[PDB]
Structure 1
Amino acid sequence: LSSSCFPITLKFVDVCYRVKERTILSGVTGMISPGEFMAVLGPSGSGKSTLLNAVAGRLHGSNLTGKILINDGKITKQTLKRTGFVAQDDLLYPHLTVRETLVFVALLRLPRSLTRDVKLRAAESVISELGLTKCENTVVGNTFIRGISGGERKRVSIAHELLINPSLLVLDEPTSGLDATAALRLVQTLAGLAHGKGKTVVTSIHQPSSRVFQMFDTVLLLSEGKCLFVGKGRDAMAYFESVGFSPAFPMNPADFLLDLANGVCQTVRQTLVTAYDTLLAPQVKTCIEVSHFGGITTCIATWFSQLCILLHRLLKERRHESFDLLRIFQVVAASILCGLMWWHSDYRDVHDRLGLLFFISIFWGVLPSFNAVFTFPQERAIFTRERASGMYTLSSYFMAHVLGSLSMELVLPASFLTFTYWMVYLRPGIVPFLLTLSVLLLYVLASQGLGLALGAAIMDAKKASTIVTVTMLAFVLTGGYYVNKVPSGMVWMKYVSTTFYCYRLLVAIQYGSGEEILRMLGCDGCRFVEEEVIGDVGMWTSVGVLFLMFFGYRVLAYLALRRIKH
C-alpha cells in the first residue's frame, strides 16, 4: 500500500567479507535513505551479490566484518519483518495460475489476526500494483508448460515480497534474462516503488541499457569489492571526467563505468580507488555520522490452518503428476492384460491364481515406490526458500505431502481392482472384494513410503531411482513365489519384504486356511498347498507389519528431511 511506509535509513560501514582468504568485499561504505532507488553496478565477481546478501541480512557470522545498520540499529528479527529480498532464481509451481499463486502466499505469509477477506484484498492489491491483471488467470508454467512471460515471472516473485508491505526491498539482478523493453518497464516499476511509495529499493543491475541507466537515483560501483563511486547517476560522468578519465567514442555511461571498474579504459583501477578515498569517501563517512535517528489451542489451529492451505495448493499442482495421461494408460493397459490372460479363471488351477496374485503384488509395489522417489528432490529449492521466509515449518509441509498422497495415489489401484476382479473370476462376494481392496490399498501406501524415505535420504532423484529398483528387486525375489527352496542364509530377507506380506494376505483372502480347495483336489501335488496356500505368517501379523511399514517409512522420511535444512 502506498502510505508513508515506515522509514528505513540503511547504513553500512567497512563491510568486509572473506570466504575460504579471498576478499569479496574490502571496505564498502554507503547509506540508502528512504525514497531512494540505488543501483549497485560492477562486473562479474565484484561482490555485488554478496553486498546485497549482507544488506538483506542473510550472510552472517564471522566471515562478515563491519557494521550494517537499520535506523542506527543492528539487524534484529523485527527489522526483517520490513525487509524483502527478491532472489535471482524464481521458484514457482508451474500449474498454478498467477492469481492462485498470490492468494496462497497471502494466506500463509500474512498474519492470522486478519480476516480472510482482508488477505484476498492484499493479494489483489499487488496484482494491480505490479500490473499483473492481464495475466492473472494464466498458469505460471516453466520451460515445458507454456505460461506467462519472462518479465511477468519476475513480477510474481516481487509480489511474494510485496505482500508483507516491506519498507526495504533488495533485488538481486532482476532484469537478467529479460528483453530490452521488459527490463525497462521493470525498472520503471521499481523506481515508482521508491519515488511514489516511500520505499527504500536497492538492486544490482547486470548490464544496464541507455535509458535504464537514466532511471537510477544513486549508483554504487564496485571493482572487486572496493567501491569506486557512490553518488547520483547523473553525476557519474562528471566525477570521472575531473579525475582524468573521459570516453573517446559515444558510449552508454553504464558501459563506461564498467570499463573503469575493470581497468580497461582506452586512452587505472588503483588510480580510481585512491581518487574515491580522497574526494568522495570522507563525504560519505560524515553522512553516516550526521544522519542520526494465544494459548495452546491457537498454535494447534495455526498448524491445521497451514496444513489445509498447503494441502489445497498441493492438490491443484500434484494432480497433473498423479493423473498424467501416460500414467493412466500404464494402468489401463495392465488392467486389460491382466483381465485377458486370466479371463474367467478357475480357482481350482491353484498355480495360475497364485501367479495372478503375485503379479498384483509386483505391479503395485514397483509402481508406487518408483513414482514416490521424485517427490521430495523435486521441491527442495521451493521448500528451502519458502520455509526460510516463514510460511510453514516442515511439519505442516510434510503432513500435507503425507495426506496429499493418501488421496491422489489410491484412485488408480482402486480402478485396477474394480475392473479385474469380476472378469478374472476372483472370489465372489462383497466381503472378499473389500478385503482384497483393503489389503491392496494398504500395500500401495506401505510401498509408497519406501520411495518417500529413499528420496528424502538421497536427495538425488536419479541415484535414488537406482536404489529403489535394487530394493524392489530383492523384495520380489523374496516375496515367496519364484523360489520355494530358499537357502538357509536368505530366509530372513522375506520378513523385511513388503511384497511378502501383501502376497500372503491376498492368498489368505482368496484361499483361506487351505481345506476348502482340499475339498476340490483330493490330497487332504500334496505339499503344493502346504507351503504355498497356508504359508507361515498369520493374517494379523501380516497386517500389523504393513502398518509398521506405513508409519515407519514416513518417520524415516521426516528424519531424513530434518537433517538437511533442505
Structure 2
Amino acid sequence: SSCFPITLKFVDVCYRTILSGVTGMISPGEFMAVLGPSGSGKSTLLNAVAGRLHGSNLTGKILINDGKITKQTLKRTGFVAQDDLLYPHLTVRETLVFVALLRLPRSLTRDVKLRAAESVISELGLTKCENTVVGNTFIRGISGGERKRVSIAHELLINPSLLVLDEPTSGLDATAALRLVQTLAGLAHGKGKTVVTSIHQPSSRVFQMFDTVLLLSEGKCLFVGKGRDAMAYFESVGFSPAFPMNPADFLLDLANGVCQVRQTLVTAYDTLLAPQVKTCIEVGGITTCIATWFSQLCILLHRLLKERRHESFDLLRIFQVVAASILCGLMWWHSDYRDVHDRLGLLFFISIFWGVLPSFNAVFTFPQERAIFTRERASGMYTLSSYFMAHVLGSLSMELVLPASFLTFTYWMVYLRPGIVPFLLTLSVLLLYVLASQGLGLALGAAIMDAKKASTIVTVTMLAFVLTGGYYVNKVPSGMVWMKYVSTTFYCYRLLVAIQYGSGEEILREEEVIGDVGMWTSVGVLFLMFFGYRVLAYLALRRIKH
C-alpha cells in the first residue's frame, strides 16, 4: 500500500506562546514519536501539522512534499483523534461497511467497496470480533484496545499516505498497548506509510519500537534524532542517569528541570542539531447531484435503524403504556355516552398523555449525537440536509406503534362510537397529534443543545398547553383567550369531540363544551405545526459552526 510517498517539513512553527521554533522533517517510511510533559504542546503540533490550524495564529511553514495544505494532498492524510465516537448497536463488521459506503468515491461499484472494508478488518486483527457488537460502558461490547482499532480502520479506508495519531495508547493495558504499537510499526515499515504519533508515558520496550524521537519541553524542542542515540547525545553535553532507568523517563525529566539545566538544553540544541537539520531542509449535472443525495439518505436510514428502536422500545416505555391502557379500560369500563361529563374527561386524558409523552422523549435526540455529527460532517461523509431528514423519516415510523396499540386495546372496552369510520378517524387524529407534539421537542432540543435545561422548558410549555386546552377553566379572563390558539392540545381535543358527538344536537334530544371552531381549520393547523416545528429545528442546527 501507498506507492505514492510523502515528505513532511514544518520549518519554524510558532503558535500564539505554545510553540516557539519547532523544526524537523519526516521521511517516508518512518515511525516518529512526539514525547513531552503534559503541557509542552505536543497536541498542538500534531493538529498544526495535519492541517487543523488554519493559518490564523499558526505563523510557520507547514509544507507537505515541498508544497502546501492544498486540498489535493489533504485527502491523502488521516488524523485519528483521541476519543472514540462509535454507535453501540452496530456490530464491528457493519460499522466498517456503512463507513466504506459513505467515504469511498461514488464512481465505483458496490463490489469493490465491500472488499475494501474487509481488507481493513483482516489487516488490523479485527477478524475475531467482527460479529460482536461494539457497545459502550452500558452495553457489553468489545475491549477498549480493540475499540481503538476500529477508529484506525475508519481512517485506512481511504488509503492515506500520512497517518497522524493523537495518544493511541492511553487507558490501554500493558500488553494491549504493545501490540498496538507493533501494528503501527508494521504500517510504516511493511506498507511504506508515514506514521507520526504522540505517546504519553511509554514503557521499557515500547521505546525500543520507535524509530525517531521528538522531545518538546514547552515549545522549543530539545532533540530530533533516531531514537537509540538519544542517551549517547546527552552524555556528550554531560547529563547522565545514576540508577538503572527507562530511557524515556530520563528524557521526560530533562524536559522539566529534574536532572541527575533546562536552559542549557535549549542553547545546546540551537548550536549542534539545528545547523544539521536545516542544511538538508531545502535540498455531472442535475441527475447526478440528486441521486447522490438519496443514496446518502438510504444508507443513513439503515445505519440508524437499530438506534431508533432502542429509543422507542425499551421495557420502561412499554410498561408506561401498558399501565395507562389498563387504567383507562378499568375506570371507564363499558362507559355510557349519555353522561357527557365522563366521556369528555376520557377524551381529554388521551390528549394530555399523548402530548406530554412524545414531546419529552424528543429533546434528547440531537444533544446526544453532536460530537459524532460534527466530526463526520467535517470529514465529508454527509451534509446536514441528509443527516436531518434521516432523523425525520426514521422517527415517524417507530413512534407510531405504541399509540396505535394503546387505542386498539382501549376503544371497544370503554365503548366509544361503534363502526369502522369513527375508529379510523379517531386513530388518524391521534397519530397526527403525536407527530405535531414530537416536533416541538425536536425544536427545543436543537435550539438549546442541553438535555437537562431543555427538559424543563418543554415542561413549562406543555403545562400551559394543558391549562388553555379547554377542560379545566370554563371561562377565561379576557386577556388569555388568545392563548389557546397556539396550543396543540386545543386542536386535538376539539377534533375528538367532533367525531364522538358531532354537531351536538344528536345528544340534545353543556353547549359551550360542544362549541364551534371548525373541523377543517383544526386539521389545517396541526399540519402547520407538523411542518413548522421541523423547519425551526433545521435552522437551529444550521447555526452550529462546526
TM-score, normalised with respect to structure 2: 0.99
Per-residue deviation at 1:15?
0.7
Q: Give the CA deviation at 1:516.
A: 1.1
CA contact (8 A) 2:2 2:159 kept: no
Q: Secondary structure at the match of 2:188?
A: helix
Indicate the residue corresponding to 1:7 in structure 2: 5
Aligned partners of 1:405 and 1:215: how far apart in 2? 50
How far apart are the structure 2 equivalents of 1:531 and 1:85?
Answer: 70
TM-superposed CA distance for 1:61, in Å, is 3.0
Which digits, 9 at most, give the CA deviation of each residue in 1:490-512, with x for residues without a partner? 11111110111111111111111
Query: Secondary structure in 2 aligned to 1:283?
Result: helix
Question: What displacement does 1:419 show?
Answer: 1.0
Q: Which moved more, 1:198-207 or 1:234-243?
A: 234-243
Runs of 4+ in 1 over 2 A off after TM superposition: 530-536
Deviations 1:367-397 (A, max 9, x none): 0000000000000111011111111101000
- Where 1:84 maps in the other structure, the secondary structure is strand
SS at match of 2:474: coil
8 A Cα contact 1:511 1:517, kept in partner: yes
Identity over aligned residues, as a percent?
A: 100
Deviation at 1:532, TM superposition (A): 4.6
- Using the alignment, how far apart are the partners of 2:238 and 2:341 within structure 1? 95
On the 8 A contact 1:12/1:67 being kept in 2, the answer is yes
Equivalent-residue separation in structure 2 for 1:360 and 1:279 (angstroms)? 82
Paired with 1:400 and 1:493, the residues of 2 have a C-alpha distance of 34
| Residues in 1 aligned to 2:499 and 2:240: alpha-carbon distance in whole angstroms | 90
Contact 2:377 2:383 in 1 (8 A): yes
CA apart distance, 1:533: 4.4
Cα offsets for 1:458-516 (capped at 9, x unmatched): 11100000000000101111111111111111111111101111111111111111111
User: In structure 2, how many angstroms separate the alpha carbons of the residues matched to 1:48 and 1:310?
Assistant: 36
CA offset digits 1:149-205 (Å, max 9, x no partner): 000110010011011111100100010110011110110011111111111110100
Unaligned runs of at least 5 residues, structure 2: none
Q: Tell me the alpha carbon deviations over residues 433-452 of structure 1, each in whole angstroms, 9 at most, x when there is no partner.
A: 11111111110010000000
- Is the contact made by 1:46 and 1:223 (CA closer than 8 Å) also made in structure 2? yes
* Aligned 8 A contact 1:513 1:533 in 2: no
Alignment partner of 1:16: what SS?
A: strand
1:40 is paired with a residue whose SS is strand
Match of 1:554 among 531, 534, 540: 534
Distance 1:48 1:415 in 2: 57
Asked whether the 8 Å contact 2:366–2:446 carries over to 1, the reply is yes
For the residues of structure 1 that align with 2:408 and 2:20, how far apart are their CA atoms? Answer: 70
User: What does residue 252 of structure 2 align with?
Assistant: 258
Rounded Cα–Cα distance in structure 1 between residues aligned with 2:512 and 2:237: 94
Q: Is the 8 A contact 1:7 1:199 kept in 2?
A: yes
Query: 1:352, CA displacement in angstroms?
Result: 1.0
Equivalences for residues 306-325 of structure 1 within 5 A: 306-325=296-315
Counterpart CA distance in 1 for 2:316 and 2:120 is 38
Structure-2 change in CA distance of 1:121 and 1:486 (3 Å): same
- Once residues 170 and 26 of structure 1 are traced to their aligned partners in structure 2, the CA distance between those partners, rounded to angstroms, is 21
Distance across 1 between alignment mates of 2:113 and 2:84? 23
2:176 alignment partner, one of 182, 185, 190: 182
Cα deviation 1:63-104 (Å, max 9, x = unaligned): 111010111111011112111000000011111111111111
Retained in 2: the 8 A contact 1:222–1:261? yes
Structure 1 residues 68 and 339: alpha-carbon distance in aligned structure 2, compared to 1, 3 A threshold: same
**Take 1:423 and 1:532, find their aligned partners in 2: how far apart are those partners?**
28
Shift of residue 141 of structure 1? Answer: 0.9
Which deviates more, 171-180 or 347-356? 347-356
2:340 and 2:233 map into 1 onto residues whose CA distance is 94
Query: Does structure 2 conserve the Cα–Cα contact (< 8 Å) formed by 1:508 and 1:533?
Result: no
Give, in whole Å, the separation in 2 of the partners of 1:98 and 1:454. Answer: 34
Does the Cα contact within 8 Å between 1:362 and 1:476 map onto a contact in 2?
A: yes
Q: Distance in 1 between matches of 2:331 and 2:514?
A: 25
TM-superposition CA deviations, 1:37-64 (whole Å, max 9, x none)? 1110001111111000011101113211
**1:251, CA displacement in angstroms?**
1.0
Moved more, 459-468 or 510-519: 510-519
How far apart, CA to CA, are the structure 2 residues paired with 1:303 and 1:121? Answer: 24
Equivalents in 1 of 2:222, 2:214: separation in Å? 8
**Which residue is equivalent to 1:542?**
522
Preserved contact between residue 174 and residue 205 of structure 1 (Cα < 8 Å)? yes
Match of residue 356 from structure 1:
346
Aligned partner of 1:122 among 116, 121, 134: 116
- CA pair 357-225 structure 1, distance change in 2 beyond 3 A: same
Tell whether the 8 Å contact from 1:446 to 1:546 is kept in structure 2 after alignment. Answer: yes
Deviations 1:534-566 (A, max 9, x none): 333211111111101110001000000000135
Alpha-carbon offset, residue 5 of structure 1: 3.4
Tell me if the contact between 1:104 and 1:309 (Cα under 8 Å) persists in the aligned partners: yes
CA separation of 1:341 and 1:532: change in aligned 2, threshold 3 A: farther
CA RMSD of aligned residues (A): 1.0
SS in structure 2 of the partner of residue 85 of structure 1: strand
Match of 2:357 among 349, 362, 367: 367
2:19 is aligned, of 16, 21, 25, to: 25
Cα distance between partner residues in 1 of 2:515 and 2:186 = 76
- Contact 1:514 1:533 (8 Å CA) reproduced: no
Contact 2:104 2:158 in 1 (8 A): yes
CA contact (8 A) 2:308 2:395 kept: no
After superposition, the Cα gap between the structure-2 partners of 1:532 and 1:78, relative to the gap in structure 1 and judged at 3 Å, is farther
Tell me the distance in 1 between the aligned counterparts of 2:105 and 2:23.
36
Please give the alpha-carbon distance, in whole angstroms, between the structure 1 residues aligned to 2:511 and 2:190: 82
User: Residue 507 of structure 1 contacts residue 533 of structure 1 at CA under 8 Å; is this kept in 2?
Assistant: no
> Cα deviation per residue 1:414-458 (whole Å; 9 max; x = unaligned)?
111111111111111111111111111110010000000000001
How many residues matched? 546
Quick check: 2:2–2:160 contact (8 Å CA) kept in 1? no
Distance apart, 1:112 and its partner CA:
1.0
Give the Cα–Cα distance (whole angstroms) in 2 for the partners of residues 238 and 531 of structure 1: 99
Tell me the secondary structure at the aligned position of residue 228 of structure 2.
helix
d(CA) in 2 for partners of 1:56, 1:318: 35
2:2–2:161 Cα contact (<8 Å) kept: no
d(CA) in 2 for partners of 1:464, 1:43? 40
User: Is the contact made by 1:511 and 1:533 (CA closer than 8 Å) also made in structure 2?
Assistant: no
- Partner residue of 1:409? 399
Cα offset for 1:531? 4.5
Take 2:511 and 2:53, find their aligned partners in 1: how far apart are those partners?
65
Matching residue of 1:203: 197
For 2:357 and 2:67, the matched residues in 1 are separated by: 56
Contact 1:479 1:494 (8 Å CA) reproduced: yes
**Aligned pair in 2 of structure 1 residues 532, 362: CA closer, same or farther (>3 Å)?**
farther
Q: C-alpha offsets along residues 333-373 of structure 1, whole Å, 9 cap, x if unaligned? A: 11111111111111112111111111111111000000000
Q: Which among 212, 215, 220 is matched to residue 221 of structure 1?
A: 215
Higher normalized helix content (fraction of residues) = 1
Q: Which moved more, 1:455-464 or 1:273-282?
A: 273-282
Which segments of 5 or more consecutive residues in structure 1 lack a partner in the other structure? Answer: 520-529
User: Do the aligned partners of 1:209 and 1:252 also contact (CA within 8 Å) in 2?
Assistant: yes
Tell me if the contact between 1:130 and 1:159 (Cα under 8 Å) persists in the aligned partners: yes
Query: Which residue is 1:131 aligned to?
Result: 125
